[PDB]
């Protein structure tokens, strides 16, 4: 009841696991392919045929 008492500490929790970065560079590369496929496919067909240009006043 009056001696010394043992010192203690605390136990934290593990952080959530991050994924390694040499995969995310590949997938943002794939997205950067697909969007340019969209712009090339619009300018290929008759869709983006700039012909009613509103010049004048």
Ligand X SMILES: *[C@@H]1O[C@H](CO)[C@@H](O[C@@H]2O[C@H](CO)[C@@H](O[C@@H]3O[C@H](CO[C@@H]4O[C@H](CO)[C@@H](O)[C@H](O)[C@@H]4O)[C@@H](O)[C@H](O)[C@@H]3O[C@@H]3O[C@H](CO)[C@@H](O)[C@H](O)[C@@H]3O[C@@H]3O[C@H](CO)[C@@H](O)[C@H](O)[C@@H]3O[C@@H]3O[C@H](CO)[C@@H](O)[C@H](O)[C@@H]3O)[C@H](O)[C@H]2NC(C)=O)[C@H](O)[C@H]1NC(C)=O
Annotate the chain with DSSP letters as a single string. --S----------PPPPPPPTTTHHHHHHHHHHHHHHHHHHHHHSSTT---------
Tokens describing residue 51? 């012909």
* Residue 13 contact, options another protein, ligand X, none, Cβ 5-8 Å cut-off depending on partner type: none
Scan residues 1-57 and list those touching another protein (CB under 8 A): 4-5, 7-10
User: Under rule CB under 6 A, how many of the chain's residues touch ligand X?
Assistant: 3
* Residue 7 contact, options ligand X, another protein, none, Cβ 5-8 Å cut-off depending on partner type: another protein
Question: What does the binding site for another protein look like in residue numbers (CB under 8 A)?
Answer: 4-5, 7-10
């Amino acid at each position: 009841k009056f001696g010394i008492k043992p010192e203690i500490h605390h136990i934290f929790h593990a952080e959530p696991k991050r994924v390694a970065k040499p995969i995310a560079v590949i997938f943002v590369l794939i997205i950067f392919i697909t969007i340019l496929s969209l712009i090339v496919t619009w300018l290929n067909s008759c869709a983006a045929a700039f012909n009613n240009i509103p010049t004048g006043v």
